[PDB]
RNA sequence: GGGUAAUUGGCGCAGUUGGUUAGCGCGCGGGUCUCAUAAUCCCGAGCUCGUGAGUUCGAUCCGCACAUUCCCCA
């Protein structure tokens, strides 16, 4: 088009998409600015966050911890480092990897408390795309967060390793293990 | 003495040349106190020698405690 928004002025958003159909439209990949810092008043309506650039969604959860509240610049720097690492291991575009990972996480079934359900009677139910993406993001970030506490290595390396593993679907990753646990326990209750 | 069967995690039982096994039981967690529920996790000369076999709780033999029946001229 007139301009391509090379993220961090390196990686583009052109030949990028999502395979899964359920959440294809709940993932914005084209309205990314050069820098994932938009003062957009997202979270104002009920479905407007479905248009937020996925990367900004990701960075907005890396500062979940109470100590690190209100720190977006460090988050953008971290994300850039992780993207270079992904490019160096894989050779491909990290955005593709990130979208594939967010798709490969996220439970497809969960247990709730329907009707009266006395005596821990929990039926099974399916899940909406929005919750799937939210949980995927939250799980990736929390998994990288848990690995780098009181450990030598930084947060960025743990982040990138988690992301690539999840894109691979390997059970070794934290998010995949959580998803499998939840899906199974819910199957028991179905 | 003669025959039959068994000794297994702290607790009784299924398991027999390729799982240390199944529950009960220990405590830490969740599930509107949170127990019936569900997750994870822990506990072993498998009575004892030889015995061949890739490999025995596991398959022969050696000895011992428990349980039923039966025999008896120092």
Separation between Cα atoms, residue A87 and residue A122, nearest integer Å: 44
Provide the CA A30 to C1' B22 distance, Å, integer.
56
On chain B, which bases lie within 7 A of the protein's CB atoms? Answer: 30-32, 35-39
Classify burial at A137, counting beta carbons within 10 Å of its beta carbon; exposed 0-12, middle 13-18, buried 19 or more.
buried
* Length of chain A, in residues: 190
- Radius of gyration, alpha carbons of chain A: 17
Which nucleotide lies at the shortest CA–C1' distance from A189?
A: B38
- The string over A49-72, giving b where at least 16 C-beta atoms fall within 10 Å of a residue's C-beta and e elsewhere, is bbebbbbbbbbbebbeeeeeeeee
Resolution in A: 3.1
Provide the CA A113 to C1' B9 distance, Å, integer.
38
Query: Experimentally, how was this structure solved?
Result: cryo-EM
Provide the CA A174 to C1' B38 distance, Å, integer.
22
Separation between Cα atoms, residue A189 and residue A107, nearest integer Å: 15
């Amino acid at each position: 088009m007139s301009l391509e928004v090379a993220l961090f002025n390196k990686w583009p958003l052109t030949d990028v998409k999502c395979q899964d159909e359920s959440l294809e439209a709940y993932i914005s990949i084209d309205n990314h600015s050069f820098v994932p810092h938009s003062a957009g008043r997202w979270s104002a309506k009920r479905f407007r966050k479905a248009k937020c650039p996925v990367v900004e969604r990701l960075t907005n959860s890396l500062m979940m911890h109470g100590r690190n509240s209100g720190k977006k610049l460090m988050a953008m720097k971290t994300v850039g480092e992780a993207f270079e690492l992904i490019n160096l291991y894989t050779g491909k575009n990290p955005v593709q990897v990130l979208v594939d990972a967010v798709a490969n996480s996220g439970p497809r079934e969960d247990s709730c408390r329907i009707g009266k359900g006395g005596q821990v009677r929990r039926q099974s139910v399916d899940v909406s795309p929005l919750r799937r993406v939210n949980i995927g993001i939250y799980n990736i970030a929390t998994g990288a967060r848990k690995a780098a506490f009181r450990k030598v290595r930084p947060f960025a390396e743990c982040l990138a390793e988690e992301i690539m593993n999840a894109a691979a679907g390997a059970d070794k990753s934290y998010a995949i293990s959580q998803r499998n646990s939840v899906e199974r326990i819910a199957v028991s209750n179905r």
